[PDB]
Design a protein around this ligand. Structure first.
Ligand SMILES: [Mg+2]
Length: 192
């Protein structure tokens, strides 16, 4: 159909995982995975991931939420915005056997190049300005209130803020089942 009316914008670190981005970005595992650009290279780190502190993992309820929302594709789209590395995010999704083929990731840049996930306000504005994007339901989740407000401001700037649910919880405290119900009740065509 070529139309995207409903978008779920998710921070990664501390929102999908249990650990705030500050204590993860410089961790050995994150730095090692940063340059692993294929599934084969990333999967070598699965054993270390599974042995890691539970807090760095994608949470059980966030995994279930991503898989549930994936079933609503293409009527709902998932966008992950993050100043972490694209290969770290893809690695963790793959370690959890989460299909991310349809998830859009706006991540950190490489080296001195600035990536779209480093400016969450600009990332939301740019995504909303894509030709296929239409007004509709917006879900925004972020464990960092400042970061989450920047995504909210991107919606306001583009006139896309009239039906927004913004959730700012601490890591591990997000009510993903509640937000899935928010999606179903506010996306009528997605009811099918
Ligand atoms: Mg975060």
């Amino acid at each position: 159909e070529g139309r995207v009316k409903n978008i779920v914008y998710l921070d990664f670190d501390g929102t999908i995982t249990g650990a705030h981005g500050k204590e993860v970005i410089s961790s050995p595992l994150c730095e090692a995975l940063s340059t692993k650009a294929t599934f084969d290279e990333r999967m070598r780190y699965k054993n270390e991931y599974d042995a890691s502190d539970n807090k760095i993992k994608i949470t059980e309820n966030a995994k279930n939420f991503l898989q549930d929302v994936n079933k609503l594709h293409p009527q709902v789209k998932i966008v992950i915005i993050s100043r972490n590395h694209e290969n770290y995010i893809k690695a963790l999704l793959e370690f959890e056997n989460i299909d991310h083929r349809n998830i859009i990731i706006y991540p950190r840049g490489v080296g001195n190049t600035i990536g779209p996930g480093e400016d969450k306000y600009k990332a939301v504005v740019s995504h909303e300005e894509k030709p296929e994007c239409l007004p509709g339901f917006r879900l925004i989740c972020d464990d960092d209130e400042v970061d989450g407000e920047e995504m909210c401001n991107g919606l306001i700037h583009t006139g896309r803020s009239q039906l927004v649910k913004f959730h700012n919880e601490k890591p591990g405290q997000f009510k993903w089942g509640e937000y899935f119900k928010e999606i179903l009740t506010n996306c009528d065509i997605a009811v099918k």
